[PDB]
Symmetry: D2
Subunit: 451 residues, 4 copies
């Protein structure tokens, strides 16, 4: 009702008002106080968005009224705030951000004591407190205290200690950074410089108006950035979103690298350095990740679509590496969430150690072809998905029903999953050949039209 | 309904909740935006109270949502925040404080562009916006910006440039300052040190829990401070409240000096250095201030009870000096509000230039005797006061009805005024002699009982 | 001896040691105190260089020991620090920067109360105090206080109030910014966004290691930036140095625009808006500036080579616009020094109002051809320049000897000037045609060889 | 030569110039770098003295030039800066303070990685580097970074966790605090309030001009403060010096309590709660501390006069409690140095748990009478002290020569020791009776005149 997949989000000063942020902070503080903790500690941060400071002030005022001490870490990436929540041994965390949404949007993400996003069980309690307003109001002497900490340099140093800095310094990669005027404008260029790379940063000045483009790093938005990467003659380019929790890589030829391929590279390196392990992923990801685990003697766990679900599965099952179809890699031993800067550091280390070119590393992975479409259908799309699953079952097709209808074929698969946010039923198909991937794609639409 | 005489007050986290502060900030920003200004600038400060930071955060978040730029001056005295509001050319000001109230209380005071407390018409507009919640919500690109400034040192320098520092340094008074862990713990001891005094400070560490006593500097609360002043052998002692907008002085003998006498000293010095002027005050203020103006060739304007009314009359009539019966002196040229530190600096300058002792300076003023009493009467207190006025009129008594019933005599007066906050009708009496002061007090009680 | 053309510079921690910065601060404070001021106020800033904070700390410690109050403005452009020195009514200013030098360099620039670089008369006293160490050591109670201020937003707002923001917002230019990880990474992209432009900034994160390139924005260094400007399809691109006192512009086609042409555009706009005035320049600049002033009914004053000389001439003669051959434009009404951000804002306003393309605006100026060469000559280069002047005088050539030997021809000139630092004698030639410009260049080389 | 017993002090801007502080910082950084550490971390703090900011700036600039990272903790007590040096795992520490010296003085104290004052072996190297100026100058890219931390609240919380807060809250003592406008104006009044006391603070506003009095809390300086304690009717009053490393206590009757008696109370409580231990002290300390250890089954180690020697002996021999004749108590497990705030907290806890009055607690200790006199004698006073020792040896008197000449009697002792700072030979005498204290005192003067 209130929170989406990860946090609540909306238009700033229209839906996410200071009253809304204050009530969210009061509900979170009430949840923390009604759990045994007598003086809960909360780490609060925000991205560069212009409405963040007002929303952060309202949230902190709400948290202090409940008797919770608040650590204000200022502007920092969402993975950095998640890391600081565990670093400070806080009882919770809050991020004022809207991820990749346009500048007019903002939102709040509530975190666990370990930095992972808030559990749905606790999110239900937060929603109940928000709508009932049964807030805990601390006495005048029990009102929490606010102190400010800087977490950018400690977080960069924490990332720097998890990679082979000497190899990067020996190679000295030439990396172009596109932080998109987001929270990554304070971490990624400096982290890459300390790794030992030659850094040319694009839109690396923190600006909540996002003068260049929307903070979503997709191919259409990164058309110009790919041209910059081509022109500068760089080894590769990396682009981040507003909260710097995602990293998108561009090769030396200005080609948009899909997130699944960079996730495959990172997972291959991590599993090889771990001698196997567990690879937690979603059901919408490529079979390229399955082959990576097979070549490394590791098991693959396919969860539902969602970064929070992947992080929960990694924590519960002691996973080694995690990621989603968008290519947001999760390093459980570092941060229980997507970390664009850690992914970039790992990719840089892989590039330095390999001795090959970035496009050579990407192309050396097993080849898969994917096609996507989104039929706009209104109504109970879950029933339609179930009916498509039944129709595929009658035709003898092997199917999986974890999140949607995934028809498990021999050389590939076709996935029929309906997004809950909007009345659209997306169809995902993939195979080892161009024709077969489209062949499975038409079958997905064929069954959908039957239902 | 919402605001009192000067700002709204209540128990922190019970009545003055973060929602309340946020709504107050949104209403104030809406008032500022609806008055033509496109990017209003607001100076926001608070006292040392523990609940201040949460309330200040809520208020600032509310102000930024309306499109107003906010200057956060941190912890500072209320007169310092008013001076900063005038100094930064801000379109308004806000103080998170409860003045002298116990530690569990907090409140918000809204200020004018010149630092004076908000006008009653604009306060009514703010109340209407608060209760209707018809707030102006700025777009994402029009959200206000917040910046932090330090005003303690500029405020001290501004006070320091208004007195004869050389005379104070020559005299080097020994002053004991009790800031009561309030916002004055950051200004008054340092200001006194820079004036050239030997400073021994009591409770000068800023603590919002007020471990020593309640921040109200009355004689009962200052019993220990008077003992400290006597023991240390100091020239005089000065005590301030939580927001440091009031100053209470103790002589070298440990005697609680009434605020009217210190106001009389300050007004005498100011009028003498001004060659006369206008002395705006209340109707409860002693005749000691009238004689001060007579000796200085100055006129006296007696307004209703309240420091905001005195400041308004000083601004409108271009007054020279202002004050109330409580002794809160207002310096119109410096700040359009009560300023404890400016009053302390002026008193220190007077003491240094006089060459006498503090008790000698206080006793050289004309002697008046005052008595106070209160009756907890529940009813139409305004009608009772009017009936007392009519009864006094029937008996031939000269009466003034500016605020309550004030019977004027040749040597003194008796005032029958009903408090507007609690069901109590207070009787104020004064005369040039001990016996006559009680005689007027008994007459006031006698007339009150006749009306009752 | 110690100071060069504008400030002292050297390798950090080898020549510009913390001892050197401390001695410089003590000498500057001694100069300020020995000039009558009882508590001088100094505005101290630095660029993004990694050695700046240690040098700034040493300089401030030296300044405080002399009894001078210090305002620390943090990392800011040199023009911003000059603007803050004038804005805070400071008695002096200091900038910890090496301008465009490689990352291993640093230095100190001392400023006047109005923000202009320190006069040579006062620089001689500073050098004498530095070498004699006859510093004024304030007493324990007279040691200056340190204060921190943020000047980025006030400086940006000051630049905004000097251009037609509405026209820029209507046009919405697409500008690519190269701040080169310098002090301009905090001002120029934000200023351009507030003007109303679409801003894509490269190397806009402040980093003192300069990972991309050396902070000098020349064509060889800006080869990649030109490709970025071409690829992005932007209206034009602007590049700044480490201290953000210079601005280099690239047109929509990725062509390196010479600083003289952008200075000509800015001067044309300023003189047209001013209805004439005085154009202060150096003798090494193009005749393009003479035609610009002639078309605007303005006078041209040609000073010696050096930005400090141009600023001094602008201040003394009440000039309207100033600049040098490198294209660093000086706006006397705003800042008495080169300002990259003000120049960028003026250029953006010109582009928005013109309605044409940047290359069209550049090409509409009168066309001149310039050729440059240098000869590494070891000897009395001043005597050789004088001998070249005499040889040209014997041949009937009109010559000006303001700074070097400038042979004033009909359609152009050839300049023979010897660099003070390097043992080289540069030859500058200009004319209205390619062949004739080279013809004048050969004559300059011919005369130099004859003297040699 | 340069450093005294603990640090170097002098008149600010005359002897302790910014050049002197810069050279000290450079020498300390050179010592840290020449000891194998690649990026040493230094915690730098100062007291409220007006000359401390420029001196701190010069010292930090010197430290950064050597390649050492600096944590600037601002204004804090010297024990707080030592605690932060140990807390941040710093490789060293520096305090800009002159302790109890008049306002015109300032100085620098260098600290060990554990917060204890710098060893004499390392102080010699620092002196050699200072005078030879053979400083290590880091490259442009190796220059250290500076960051600021607030240590007041963490230090107060650390002190709170070491005492029984509940007993103090139950008792609610009424304590008068005299911080003398020093660095203790930021910690002690707040610490005592969080303990649960009613706090009336005197001169608790931090001012480097010291408008009230010199920051030395002696009886002549505290004459007015004793009157304040009497007038307010408080349980007891505690006074601190400028750096807040010493605490002087005044009972409810306004009587100046000697530091030895408060040290005896604290040591008794600590040893009782420890079941015995080692009581490290000086040879000038009263026998009152010996009886305290005897009653608690603890041993006494008597070192030479000086707080640094006491701290060194506490660290090397794993001592339990330490202190000197002045009464500066050292808690080895908390801070390897004098801590006025920890001593005040322990005294408050003892007072709360005792149920008696402060004068009753002080008077319950065994009674000793002490007399102090000095003779201004020039020349080699060490030879004179040795000759007095020989004369006492000839007369059959038992003598100890750990520091000066201490004649060990049965009910008391007389000590003949000359301070090296000034040409004065002090005579310390003590006995269990008033008459014998003077009787031993005259014997000390008698033997001194014989030499």
């Amino acid at each position: 009702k209130l929170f989406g997949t990860f946090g609540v989000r909306g238009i700033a000063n229209e839906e996410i008002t200071p009253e809304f942020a204050l009530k969210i902070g009061m509900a979170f503080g009430t949840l923390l106080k009604r759990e045994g903790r007598e003086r809960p500690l909360v780490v609060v941060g925000r991205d560069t968005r212009v409405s963040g400071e007002m929303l952060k002030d309202a949230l902190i005022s709400g948290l202090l009224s409940t008797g919770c001490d608040v650590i204000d870490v200022g502007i920092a990436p969402t993975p950095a705030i998640q890391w600081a929540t565990n670093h400070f041994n806080a009882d919770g965390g809050a991020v004022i951000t809207a991820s990749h949404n346009p500048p007019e949007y903002n939102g709040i993400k509530l975190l666990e004591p370990n930095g992972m996003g808030l559990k749905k069980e606790r999110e239900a309690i937060v929603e109940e407190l928000f709508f009932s307003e049964d807030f805990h109001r601390a006495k005048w002497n029990e009102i929490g205290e606010l102190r400010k900490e800087d977490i950018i340099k400690p977080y960069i140093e924490a990332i720097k200690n998890r990679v082979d800095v000497e190899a990067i310094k020996k190679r000295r990669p030439f990396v172009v950074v596109d932080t998109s005027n987001g929270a990554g404008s304070l971490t990624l260029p400096y982290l890459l410089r300390e790794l030992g790379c030659k850094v040319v940063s694009v839109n690396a000045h923190p600006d909540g108006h996002f003068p260049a483009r929307n903070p979503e790093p997709n191919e259409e938005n990164l058309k110009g950035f790919m041209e910059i990467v081509k022109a500068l003659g760089a080894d590769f380019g990396v682009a981040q979103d507003g909260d710097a929790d995602r990293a998108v890589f561009i090769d030396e030829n200005g080609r948009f690298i899909q997130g699944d391929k960079t996730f495959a590279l990172v997972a291959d390196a991590v599993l090889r350095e771990n001698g196997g392990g567990l690879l937690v992923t979603t059901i919408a990801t490529s079979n390229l990740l399955d082959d990576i685990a097979k070549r490394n003697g590791a098991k693959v766990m396919r969860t539902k679509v969602g970064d929070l679900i992947v992080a929960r599965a990694l924590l519960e099952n002691n996973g080694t590496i995690g990621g989603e179809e968008n290519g947001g890699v999760i390093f459980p031993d570092f941060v229980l969430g997507r970390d664009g800067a850690m992914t970039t550091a790992k990719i840089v280390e892989i590039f330095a150690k390999s001795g090959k070119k970035f496009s050579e590393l990407i192309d050396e992975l097993p080849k898969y072809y994917q096609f996507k479409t989104k039929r706009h259908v209104e109504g109970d799309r879950k029933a339609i998905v179930a009916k498509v699953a039944e129709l595929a079952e009658k035709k003898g097709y092997k199917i999986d029903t974890t999140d949607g209808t995934k028809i498990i074929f021999d050389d590939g698969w076709v996935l029929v999953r309906a997004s809950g946010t909007e009345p659209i039923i997306r169809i995902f198909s993939e195979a080892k050949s161009e024709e077969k991937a489209r062949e499975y794609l038409e079958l997905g639409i064929k069954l959908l039209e039957e239902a």
